[PDB]
Each structure stands twice: as structure tokens, then as C-alpha cells.
Amino acid sequence: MVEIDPFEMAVKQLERAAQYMDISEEALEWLKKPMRIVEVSVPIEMDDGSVKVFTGFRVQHNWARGPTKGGIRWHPAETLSTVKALATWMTWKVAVVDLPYGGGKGGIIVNPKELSEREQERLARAYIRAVYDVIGPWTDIPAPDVYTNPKIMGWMMDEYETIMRRKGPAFGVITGKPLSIGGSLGRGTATAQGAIFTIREAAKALGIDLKGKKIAVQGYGNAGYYTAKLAKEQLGMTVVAVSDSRGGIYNPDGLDPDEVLKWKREHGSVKDFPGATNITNEELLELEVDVLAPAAIEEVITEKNADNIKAKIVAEVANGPVTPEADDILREKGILQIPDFLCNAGGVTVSYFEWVQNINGYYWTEEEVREKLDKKMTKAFWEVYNTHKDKNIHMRDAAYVVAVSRVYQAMKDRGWVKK
């Protein structure tokens, strides 16, 4: 009765969003099971002269469009179901911005805050010697995620280059590397620069002038910061309300997004910033602003606080903040929501340009990446909006129809599914 599984809930989104499209019944049973699951045992040697054996996974969902790509999680609450949900979530995130990629994810059941800097070096290498047979530059490309960093993706690249004996483009096996070993420029601002281009194109689609309007950003991590910072520079909007995990502040005359960080960098919160009016986390959503952006956590907009939202664009930067009970309540009010794999798709697009550079060998500049990131997201948003105008559906439901049909057409041309 009461079972909350991630993989069976990640299939239930696909079975819901298959009714809006004409898809054969032999492709629906192909997209519900990952094509290769490698579950390995990863042994390291501790500092006291002992051996511990952790568990490691690597799920590859679908390589119909190209080489599969996805992050690596290090968490003690990792299961095989929690990787297979994010594996089948990735193939609709590398398709809607039209990349030649497939989905994947991997994980190690470990607690990284109780390993020193030497044991993290042995754990990162001994993962690569266990799953070397299923990764590579043209086969499967890792990436950093929760509790990993670009420092660790340097070590995993060194162990792969030692096994390969340097007979191939070893700088392209793993993206999110440091700068001096073959990374890309303009990677720390990627997840928010994706959100700005889709917000700018949304108000152009909705017919809203933006010079002088007000944007409230919920959550003030590393992703919600630049969304506040770039809004005052590139867009021209006045940031009026931010928040962190404790509480929020408010000023309708502007909150300068640089100095709110340094106030938080001193203490650890944004409470009692000078020249503002402190509010809670809950009251930020029921404000009266031009564009709201949930960037903090999951399930913040549900059946209770759905109708009280007074905004015009709700750009879901964080991973699924709005629940589908609230999507019925918000859409009849005329609210343009941007889907969660369409607003933070800057993470995969710039980490794709770190794979294009390393394969060829010619490194691009900073402005050559931002001018190429704007070309993808503008086109990828106007494939999702124009599909929404035709079948008369929600933008979350219409972003799935474009995402599935590219994978289904790629399986049909390869001869995998006949009908």
C-alpha cells in the first residue's frame, strides 16, 4: 500500500505523458527498463591498514541518440532505485535542448564527510578501475553532482588515462574538470544563465516589457545567487526579495544581489539585512511580483499555497518545486510556467561544450560559449512553446512530448522498434 519508490514514480510520469502523442506499444515497454545496469564492488584501503568494500552502481538508460551522459552522486542514502529514476530523467533533459546524448547516472553508497583527502583519492580511482569496461569518451561520460566537486573529476580522469595508455581523447571522458587540465570557461554560471534566457524569451512570448519589473528568488545557494545577480545586470529587473534556508528579506526599492551574499557570507543567514523588511520563507511566494523563481527545494507549491500566488512567470529552476495538483490551479489563472528540465538545462549544455572542445582539441573562449548557449535555449524554448499552442496543454506536459518523440524517432530509425 504505502510505498514511495523513485523509479516507479519516474515511470508514472512517462505513462501519463504518453497519451498526448501517438506512440507504439512496443516503444513504451522499451523506455521503462534501463539497457545496462552495472553494480560493482569498490574496494579501498583505509588509513589504519584495513580494507573496506563499498557498493557502486552505473545505470545507462538509452544510447539511441548518442553517448550517454550523467552525473555521479556520493550519498549514504543511495539505492538502485534512486539512480534508475535519475537515469530515466536524464534522457528527457538531454533531448529537449537537442543534444546528441543519452541518459545515465552512477553512485557510490558512501558518506564522504568521514573520509580524509587521501581516502577520497583512492575511492575516486578505485571506482574507475571497476567500471572501466562500460565508460569512455564515445560510450558513457560522467559528470559531477551532489557531494562531488571538480577536484574529484581530475582524479578520475588521471586513473582512466593510466588504464587507456593514452591511445585516445582522454580529456573528454569526464566533464566538469578543472580549468588547467581541460575544462571549459563559463561553467559556474551555467545553471542560472539557462534560466535567464528562458525567462527573457518567456516575457517576449507573453508580451511583457521587463525594464523595471520585479523578480523574487527563493533560495540563495550557488544557483539562486546568479539568478538574482544576472537579473539586475542582463535583464534590467529590480530584485526585491530573496531568502535562504532560515528566512527571507524584502525591499520594493531594490535588494542589491552582491551585498546580500557578503552579509550571508559573514554570519550564515540573510536575517536583518540593513534597509529591508524581514519576512519568512512562506510569505515570499504570496508576494506581488512580475516573475517568481523557486530555486530552493522540492514541493514548495502544493494544494494549499497554489491559489495565493500573484505572479506572471514561475520559472522552476530547482528540480520540480511545483506539484501537479498546483499545475491545474495555476494554469487556469494564466501563468506561464517553465519546466524544470527546460529552465536548468544550462547545466548539460555547457557541460556538452566541455566535451566538444576536448574531442577536437581547440578551446573556445568565454564569450564564444555564452553566444552559443543562447542559440540552443532560444530554439529549445520555441519548440516547447509552439507545441503548447497547438495541442492546448500545459508547458510541463508539452515539454515531455518533444522530449519523448526525439528518443522514439531515434529508436525507430536505428531499427530497434519496428512499428
Swiss-Prot record:
Instruction: Respond yes or no to whether keyword NAD is given for this record.
Output: yes
Under the GO molecular function aspect, what terms does this record hold?
glutamate dehydrogenase (NAD+) activity; glutamate dehydrogenase (NADP+) activity
Q: What is this protein called?
A: Glutamate dehydrogenase
Give the originating organism.
Thermococcus profundus
**EC identifiers of the protein:** 1.4.1.3
Q: Which Pfam families does this entry report, sorted A to Z?
A: ELFV_dehydrog (PF00208), ELFV_dehydrog_N (PF02812)
| Family indicated by similarity | Belongs to the Glu/Leu/Phe/Val dehydrogenases family.
The UniProt entry's GO biological process terms, in alphabetical order, are:
glutamate catabolic process
- Superkingdom assignment: Archaea
The UniProt catalytic activity note for this protein reads: L-glutamate + NAD(+) + H2O = 2-oxoglutarate + NH4(+) + NADH + H(+); L-glutamate + NADP(+) + H2O = 2-oxoglutarate + NH4(+) + NADPH + H(+)
- Could you name the active-site residues? K105
The record's top EC class is oxidoreductase
Q: Where, in this chain's numbering, is NAD(+) bound?
A: G219, Y220, G221, N222, A223, G224, Y225
Keyword annotations for this protein, in alphabetical order, are: NAD, NADP, Oxidoreductase
